[PDB]
Design a protein around this ligand. Structure first.
Ligand SMILES: [Mn+2]
Ligand SMILES: [Mn+2]
Ligand SMILES: [Mn+2]
Ligand SMILES: [Mn+2]
Lengths: 242, 240, 242, 240
């Protein structure tokens, strides 16, 4: 079983992703195409490269080209420092190949929005927010109920369990209105296995607290991504390239 | 002189803007093309239509197609309700014709970012922030100094002085890194007068307050223009 | 009734057309944006500008941005000079606003192909070729029969008669296979009146013999566009701008 | 050494090429993505896959996605049947990776035109036409002289000499005027070795004869490569 991605496999993956992104008019700078942009969620997912990104097999791997991750702390009243972490601005292009997924997880602080650029996006989520402490949270526009899962959702071997709570389904396409995924909601998505092209989606969200002189002292060592699956939640950061 | 835009002028202006937006893959739905998307900053700016959007003359008029304006209040701890207005997510596509401007102004709460999609964007701004309300504010990544203005910029007649404080300049093109304009910073921008195409820019910013997620958000004004006339021209577009 | 297009109307029309073309990646050079690119088929069609290109009213007006019109005579055996006029290469982008048409006509020498870039193209044609002299013409892939006209085809006032022979219908969209319109076939097309965008179509055809040191002596003064309507066939060239 | 391309390599090569084509708005239908769209010009060129399409090494391999290849015989006077083969309409999208080439060759009948869609195209050609068959040919707009080759062009190993006769050079970019390559002219092209993206070019040409509209068209060969090996690599792609 694969334990890493070869330099050739990785370079071709990111190069073709960056080329497709540019063709779609997403602003890609050299610095954005790095050894951290191609993500493998769990060591058991490197097996995705045994047959490759066009095998159409179910695995949790994807490319993220981040053009923006602005704290938006400047100008913020000091009195609001405690919750600045729920704000900020992040713009990234996500490229997911046929049959692949962005694994089940939720964010305590980050709210996201999706805009499909190419292909079709199958989003899976929990209409109800996870309970985070004895917090008295605000409400305004709760997540829509959505529809039940369609037929054809091949889940990654050994991870099917982590998708159990994501009962709601919505399929997004280019030209559709923006879709918002409120913070504290379990979610995941995949590119249909029969898709002729990789799924390309622009995500505009609040600040992304992920490992990679902090905006605020309290922001140091802050992880805002909690995955359901252990393999992904505990040990999914850096990408092993050999 | 012009006191309003004709129905035909408005329809062609927004129909072509929305068509260009769609060609550039921006998600445009019907409710986005409305009576307020074509903005004229002041009654004296309707004269921009005496010769049209391809006259290359300096006027402050533009189209904004907003695909998202999410409060992002859901899930936020009640304890942060007081400053939730500084957050949120807004996505809009701005179309500015040759020589036209988005006039000098600042936002107390909204921080923006620019991504040029078509054409080139000339940004004029003040690198030092203004103080709006609360004295003690946070700081992390101050606005860069950019460069001084280039020669030959044509400003709108009678609005020249309003640009005096925006001494820094940067010219953005497609493919460039995202440019951030922190809240409380005076800024403005134009499409070069000699541009072959209209300037098209995607703006990703915090919530856009335009007269509710929270009680205190009601009737909140977050756009302060330097020119008195420009403030007036932002309420409603006069379409004859 | 309108007798010409104002300089402002014309410049805005061509400028927005060239901008849209560039946005769609069609190579537009300054020389391609000229006073002949915006075409009005007949003096009775200038009325299209009484209410404008977004009035959605039926008129025969359009923009043609020609990036190529190559004789392809170079290297051709002298023995084939007699029929070089049926060859050549022409690449042009056609932009037609909601409800507007490219008027009924046929070409004796030019064969065309269509590739919709934006919007939807409603093509009207005669499945059978017009008879041009006692010619013994070649055959290989005759025009498909197509379907009958749909409901919603508002024809230009005073020209509805010229559309009578174009009995076959086909609706083209972006991503569809290339559609070929063989020479000697009456044809026309329009952008649906309810379209949210102007119809943008790339036409790749054989040489376009239209008024504007000839490739071949016999090519001088050669017109290959025969329109059904008199107003268009006799007096539709130059565009009157005032 | 490599004697064929692996199934996975071929699938990823064409799937990414077709995806890029679609993103660039080229009309790709299923029958266009086939076992002959990924071309390897010679058995010695399969080595291009030893390190891959992003190795930036000079090899003669490319993908061609043909959306149209119309004989244009319908309606043509029978009297012109003898030279109908010099006409017709072909539309194809060519994708060439960094440092890769479309090898030196000429067509007796096909005249082509290039429109760069993504990246930059370096064209090497002979401005003087070769004589193929008939002596008396027509002339109107001779190929321009272009410029001499720029410094540093890396050629495929063992194929260097085949480029000797293509002394003229032109570099084409997106938005440039269409470039015409008349029939009977030796030509070749590559994507710069340092290009950040694959070169994507739309070719509009007369009919592409590849082994019927007319009896005489059967088994017609209209591609003559300078390198003997390159001629061999054009028949069928070895996919293991
Ligand atoms: Mn997420
Ligand atoms: Mn602003
Ligand atoms: Mn025609
Ligand atoms: Mn060739």
């Amino acid at each position: 079983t694969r334990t890493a991605i070869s330099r050739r496999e990785y370079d071709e993956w990111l190069s073709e992703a960056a080329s497709l992104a540019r063709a779609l008019r997403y602003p890609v700078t050299p610095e954005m195409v790095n050894d951290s942009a191609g993500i493998v969620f769990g060591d058991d997912q490197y097996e995705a490269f045994a047959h490759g990104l066009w095998s159409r097999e179910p695995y949790e791997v994807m490319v993220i080209l981040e053009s923006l991750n602005e704290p938006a702390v400047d100008g913020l009243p000091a009195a609001g420092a405690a919750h600045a972490e729920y704000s900020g601005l992040c713009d990234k292009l996500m490229i997911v190949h046929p049959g692949k997924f962005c694994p089940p997880h939720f964010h305590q602080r980050k709210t996201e929005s999706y805009e499909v650029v190419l292909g079709e996006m199958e989003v899976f989520y929990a209409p109800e927010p996870v309970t985070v402490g004895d917090d008295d949270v605000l409400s305004f526009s709760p997540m829509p109920e959505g529809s039940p899962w369609p037929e054809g959702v091949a889940l990654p071997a050994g991870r099917e369990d982590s998708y159990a709570g994501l009962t709601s389904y919505v399929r997004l396409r280019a030209g559709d209105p923006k879709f918002v995924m409120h913070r504290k909601h379990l979610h995941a998505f995949r590119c249909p296995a029969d898709s002729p092209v990789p799924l390309v989606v622009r995500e505009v969200s609040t600040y992304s607290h992920e490992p990679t002189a902090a905006p605020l002292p309290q922001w140091r060592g802050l992880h805002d991504n909690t995955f359901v699956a252990e393999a992904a939640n505990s040990g999914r950061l850096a990408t092993a390239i050999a």
